[PDB]
Design a protein around this ligand. Structure first.
Ligand SMILES: CNc1ccccc1C(=O)O[C@H]1C[C@H](n2cnc3c(=O)[nH]c(N)nc32)O[C@@H]1COP(=O)(O)OP(=O)(O)NP(=O)(O)O
Ligand SMILES: CNc1ccccc1C(=O)O[C@H]1C[C@H](n2cnc3c(=O)[nH]c(N)nc32)O[C@@H]1COP(=O)(O)OP(=O)(O)NP(=O)(O)O
Ligand SMILES: [Mg+2]
Ligand SMILES: [Mg+2]
Lengths: 166, 166
């Protein structure tokens, strides 16, 4: 079975985990619960293809210092998430893209830029500003909302689509 | 307003029109109605971006001989659809990809390969076979069902995503 090793990175607090749980077990966790490392595995059919999604939920805090280096070594594709109401988590993105190209040895790694939490009105990261980050990376920009599930499957499946042509 | 000129090509009968109507006016047309040329325009918000989708529904029959050349001249991105229960409509795809590169002057035009009608069990085009067409084009493969709307927005939005990095 084609297995897809997806890796959800991003600053602490952006909804990394709320998005994986949304995708996987069909409900929003409106709750403070910091991750260390949760992995998830699920039979899915993506575009007729039957495959296992083996997603590794990660912590955003660099208490997970170079413990990061390990999984970015093994991750095939990555969800880079930031919250659209948090310019700082946007500005952290360049940091992850850098570490990932680092351990991963390549300038172009399958990746998706994901502007999560779009359901809310206090947005400080404008869309085109994010669409301009994504384009300079040559990656897709997908806005999501783990609350309303808008974009949730879009962001995860497009990345599987990415890993394919790579 | 960013306008996206999408063009839905493909053999006669594959569901080209059922997919545009699904996207646009939220219901399946289980009905014989051959197209000549229907255009559609709709305000959408794709990834925070507010934009007009100006889709041109097309006929599959080459009674629309070189009347094709005109719109493929002007279309920015294209939905290439075939029915997964119709090996012939799959084999027609290379024909459209060829005409499109023709009038369009470029080897790589934003495009989406779309294996529509996936809800049904009489499938003669296997997914990976189609996933191998798509990859040799270096384009996304998206299976849809205008009946159940599975993939319907996926296929149209990913193409808008395509036109972006182009
Ligand atoms: C009662 N609620 C709180 C009180 C105090 C502190 C925190 C919260 C809290 O639970 O907020 C949560 C949900 C919210 N969340 C996730 N995704 C979305 C989204 O799409 N929209 C909205 N509106 N909220 C979201 O985003 C916050 C963090 O979610 P998470 O999924 O745990 O975030 P993470 O990316 O996994 N952070 P980490 O790196 O620590 O694991
Ligand atoms: C009572 N029904 C018929 C009787 C006789 C002849 C034709 C039909 C008939 O209506 O079949 C339709 C719907 C079906 N359709 C479209 N999409 C789907 C899909 O996703 N799944 C299924 N199950 N059917 C679909 O696909 C057929 C063609 O749909 P269309 O959307 O009109 O196809 P087109 O691609 O626009 N053909 P064209 O080039 O002529 O405009
Ligand atoms: Mg968490
Ligand atoms: Mg029609």
């Amino acid at each position: 079975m084609t297995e897809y090793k997806l890796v959800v990175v991003g600053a602490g607090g952006v909804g990394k985990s709320a998005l994986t749980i949304q995708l996987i077990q069909n409900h929003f966790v409106d709750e403070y619960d910091p991750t260390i490392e949760d992995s998830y595995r699920k039979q899915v059919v993506i575009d007729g293809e039957t495959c296992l999604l083996d997603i590794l939920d990660t912590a955003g805090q660099e208490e997970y210092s170079a413990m990061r280096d390990q999984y970015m070594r093994t991750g095939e594709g990555f969800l880079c998430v930031f919250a659209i109401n948090n310019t700082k988590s946007f500005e952290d993105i360049h940091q992850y893209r850098e570490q990932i190209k680092r351990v991963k040895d390549s300038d172009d790694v399958p990746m998706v830029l994901v502007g999560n939490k779009c359901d809310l009105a206090a947005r400080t990261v404008e869309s085109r500003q994010a669409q301009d980050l994504a384009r300079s990376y040559g990656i897709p920009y997908i806005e999501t909302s783990a609350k309303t599930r808008q974009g949730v499957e879009d962001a995860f499946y497009t990345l599987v689509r990415e890993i394919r042509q790579h």
